[PDB]
Design a binder for this molecule. Sequence first.
Ligand SMILES: [Mn+2]
Length: 218
Amino acid sequence: DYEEQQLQKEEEARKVKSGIRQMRLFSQDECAKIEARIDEVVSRAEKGLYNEHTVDRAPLRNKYFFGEGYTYGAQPGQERLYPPGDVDEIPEWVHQLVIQKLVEHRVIPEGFVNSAVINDYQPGGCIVSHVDPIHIFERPIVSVSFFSDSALCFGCKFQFKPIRVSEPVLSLPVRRGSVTVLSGYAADEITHCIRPQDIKERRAVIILRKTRLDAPRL
Ligand SMILES: [Mn+2]
């Protein structure tokens, strides 16, 4: 049975990989300049200069929503965009330093991205198993990593089983300055998550997405 389980995990991992594209697009210098602006965002949030729904604080992780943000609404799936104008606009530097570079290297089309979420993790931070809500966001899902090298996990059923019973279907290395593009199986047909032990130093990720025109709002 365990041999079968193992072969099955390998097969699923192949399928996950089919929907993953990665590249290193930001040099150490570009990363440093972007990292300084991420620190500016954190500073302005701590000064209380953003709207309430822009900033979501948790013990080992903060989220900063720009352009569009979402939350669980009263109950498609339950996630809902905030009302228009509730979250702060995407900062110019995200357009100029990050998105424009992605467009230049043909990762996404011009005018695709209208949502930018900055996730800032301290060592030990955790994200629950999830699929990016398909009734909110079009594919592909793009993420850009900063401050340190880490890992993104796919197939996250292990989160709900005892330690030593299960493991991620795929652990994907995500290096500082790398761009990760999720489509097909990887974005639609399996969960992803982050494990505390994989965050060894501060890690930040800029998640760049397109909201559906018909995405429901609160
Ligand atoms: Mn996600």
